[PDB]
């Protein structure tokens, strides 16, 4: 039924590019750099640190997701606190280092941002 409805309605839409102006995908370079917007008025500091990561189709995404899960995520509202398995989360809860910290694995077609974001 979905296929028939698609044939009924979306069929007119075409993949031809006017005057053969076809957009071409471009690999994006990853540049190790630091951008600091120092605004001492703000209550808490947000820092995001990342390294270049695999693309969507790269097989290494799964082990990296396992590694990030090992690192874990913590927020001040988490009940686990000190006893939480994540060493970073445990130390953060014990010393009240950060309000929240989470690990992200953003993946794009050919590059990705692998790292963590912590508010402290």
């Amino acid at each position: 039924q979905l296929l028939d409805l698609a044939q009924k309605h979306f069929s007119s839409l075409s993949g031809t590019y006017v005057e053969d102006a076809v957009p071409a995908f471009t690999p994006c370079r990853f540049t190790g750099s630091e951008i600091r917007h120092r605004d001492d008025a703000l209550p808490l500091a947000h820092v995001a640190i990342a390294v270049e990561g695999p693309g969507w189709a790269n097989p290494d995404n799964v082990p990296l997701q396992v590694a990030n899960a090992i690192i874990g995520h913590y927020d001040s509202t988490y009940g686990g606190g000190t006893h939480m398995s994540s060493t970073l989360a445990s130390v953060a809860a014990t010393r009240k280092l950060c309000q929240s910290f989470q690990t992200f694995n953003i993946c794009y077609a050919e590059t990705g941002l692998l790292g963590a974001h912590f508010v402290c």
Partner: protein
């Protein structure tokens, strides 16, 4: 007391930096460095050199005057 956290209050100052491994250690070292050195020397020289020029003049004058002092005076043995 003096620690990075509470040194001073600054706002809305954004700084962009590059990784050392992504940038060249010596960028335009001679093409830009030599003109900059010349500019710095031009700015400083008028203030710096003249005292040492005066010292050199004084030193030469003193050395020559001492050498003259040691030298014989003919008039002393005229008689």
């Amino acid at each position: 007391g003096r620690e990075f956290g509470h040194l001073t209050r600054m706002r809305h100052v954004i700084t962009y930096s590059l990784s050392p491994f992504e940038q060249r250690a010596f960028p335009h070292y001679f093409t830009k460095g030599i003109p900059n050195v010349l500019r710095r020397t031009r700015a400083c020289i008028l203030r710096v050199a003249p005292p040492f020029v005066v010292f050199y003049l004084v030193y030469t004058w003193g050395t020559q005057e001492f050498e003259k002092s040691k030298r014989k005076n003919p008039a002393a043995y005229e008689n």
